[PDB]
Every structure is written in C-alpha cells, then in structure tokens.
Ligand binder design. Structure first.
Ligand code: HEM
Ligand SMILES: c1ccc2c(c1)CCN2
Length: 291
C-alpha cells in the first residue's frame, strides 16, 4: 500500500494557519466542556486514535485516509467519547471545506498541544480522503488493563521504540478517564489542561494503591485524588521504561523535544511525501500572534 501526500489545490502556509487559528479560537470559546477542562485533551486523543490504527507491515490504517468519518471506525468501542472531538471540529470543516479529513483531525491534535502550552509540533499537509472500504477494522487500538511487555509489543506495530513510547505516554497528564467511555475513572494530576511533564513526576512521587472502580476494573489510585491505568503504572515496573521516566521527570525540555518528534512521527506514519512537497509548517500560537 503506497499513500502519497497531495497538497490541497493551491493551498499554502497561510491557509492552514487560518484553520489553526479557527480551532484555537474555538478552544478558547468552548471552555466549559468536561467540567472546564475544555476540548484540548479529547482533540489530542482523537489525533492519536486516527493514527494509532496504522500497521507497519502492510501500511494499512494510519492518519492518511481520514476513515474515522466512516461508521465502522466511528463506532469502534475503543473510540467511545471521541464523538465530542468530531462534533467540535465539524463547524471548522464547514468553514474550510477544502481541507481533507485526515489533515483536519491531525491538525486539531497539533493545535490543542501548542495552545495548552506544549512544544511546537512540525505538521505536514497532504492527507487525502479514501473510500469507506479502506476503513481499518476494530481492534487495532491498545487495551488499558495490561502490562509493560504488552505496551512494548503493541507499539512495535507502529514502530515506536521505548523512548518514543514513554515520551508519547506523557500526554496522559492531560484530561481524564471517564467511566462511561472506558470503565476507568479519574484524572492523573492537577494540571490536566496545561501540557507539562507531571505524568512522570506523579508516577514517581505519589503513593499508589491498586483499587477496583465502579465498572469493576482495577486501577492505581492515590491519596491526592489521581489515578493511573495498569498500562500507565507499567512504566515504573519495567527497568528500561523506568529509567526514561526518571529522565523526563528530571528534564522538562528533553520531554518536550522528544514528545514533539514522536507525535509528528505518529501523525505521519504511512505517508509518502514527494521531494517537491513543502517543508513542515510550524504554526504560531494565538498568543504569539497577539490574537
Ligand atoms: C497503551 C497506550 C494507551 C492506552 C491503553 C490508552 C488508554 C486510554 C484510556 C482508557 C483513556 C480514557 C478514555 C476515556 O474514558 O475518556 C485514555 C485517555 C487519553 N489518552 Fe490514552 N492511551 C494510550 C496511549 C495514549 C497516547 C500515546 C496518547 C497521546 C499521544 C494518549 C492520549 C490520551 C489523552 C489526551 C486522553 C484524555 C482524553 C480525555 O480527557 O477525554 N493516549 N487513554
Ligand atoms: C487519561 C487517561 C489515563 C490516565 C490519565 C488521564 C491520568 C493518568 N492515567
């Protein structure tokens, strides 16, 4: 399967910076969502789940085709709760009907991270919508109730290595688990709509307790009111993972730099970019624009 990036006709940096600003302006406006967390965390989760279907072996799945717009992927049990990120973006797609679905879902994730004061993420245009029959089947996204060997093995399919996996998981400092979506409940920290390295700090400094929640699932709970998933706590159980966790709890700039590279790579897996294709765009935030 080859998927070649095709820039939307005649579009350039300024067009996509207009779509960025539209998403970012609505993130500021619709602030009440999920008890004032706002839409940013569900939008970086949506960009991860449309990319996380990729399989390196046959180049199926991935962010290129925008296939989450089809019922099979929209109704995947693993995507429960992401309909709220879709409905947030649907106004903006009506306003810029020329951007492809893959591009709009991935730029929403980029915009949310930078607007929640994360690192800049280089983003590239050119994903092309593909037919309903290209939609990957349910079951390619990871279970939460498993251990470190499962996480390592699952992420080899998206060929991410240990460092990349640990840098990507730092995004679980954002938002929260919702019992009616996943059977898990609670936030992982106090700053859950500002991008920081707090996931790593909480993992190493809190007093975790294995408890059973109302959906009868086990999760790691702390006195402070935070929770960690079994696959999250996995990172301090494995010796290779645990020493990268310590590296990111001791250096927030290295965390930001490595997250930026692994999230771009995540979003680009499966796509062939021609050598005459434009460079990756670095978008300015509303704040850097005085907007
Ligand atoms: C083995 C890996 C992973 C598993 C099992 C997993 C699982 C989960 C689960 C069960 C939730 C709760 C969903 C809900 O109830 O609403 C969640 C939320 C979230 N995850 Fe993951 N995740 C994984 C990796 C990642 C990665 C790599 C990213 C992003 C780079 C990510 C970003 C998020 C975000 C931002 C949320 C919060 C959503 C919200 O607030 O609504 N996840 N994760
Ligand atoms: C979302 C998903 C999982 C998780 C958090 C948020 C806090 C720590 N575990």
């Amino acid at each position: 399967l080859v998927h070649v990036a095709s820039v939307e006709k005649g579009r350039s940096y300024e067009d996509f910076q207009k779509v960025y600003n539209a998403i970012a302006l609505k993130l500021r406006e619709d602030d009440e969502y999920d008890n004032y967390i706002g839409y940013g965390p569900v939008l970086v989760r949506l960009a991860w789940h449309i990319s996380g279907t990729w399989d390196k072996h046959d180049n199926t799945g991935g962010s290129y085709g925008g296939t989450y717009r089809f019922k099979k992927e929209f109704n995947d049990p693993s995507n429960a709760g992401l309909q709220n990120g879709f409905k947030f973006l649907e106004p903006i797609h009506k306003e810029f009907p020329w951007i492809s679905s893959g591009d709009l879902f991935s730029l929403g994730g980029v915009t949310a991270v930078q607007e929640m004061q994360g690192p800049k993420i280089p983003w590239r245009c050119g994903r092309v919508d593909t037919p309903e029959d290209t939609t990957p089947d349910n079951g390619r996204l990871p279970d939460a109730d498993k251990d470190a060997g499962y996480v390592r093995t699952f992420f080899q399919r998206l060929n991410m290595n240990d460092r990349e996996v640990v840098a990507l998981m730092g995004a679980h400092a954002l938002g929260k688990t919702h019992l009616k979506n996943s059977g898990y409940e609670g936030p992982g920290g106090a700053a859950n709509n500002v991008f920081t390295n707090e996931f790593y700090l909480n993992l190493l400094n809190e007093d975790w307790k294995l408890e059973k929640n109302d959906a009868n699932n086990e999760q790691w709970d702390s006195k402070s009111g935070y929770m960690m998933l079994p696959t999250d706590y996995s990172l301090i159980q494995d010796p290779k993972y645990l020493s990268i966790v310590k590296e990111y709890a001791n250096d927030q700039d290295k965390f930001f730099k490595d997250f930026s590279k692994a999230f771009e790579k995540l979003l680009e897996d499966g796509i062939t970019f021609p050598k005459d294709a434009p460079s990756p765009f670095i978008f300015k935030t509303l704040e850097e624009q005085g907007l």
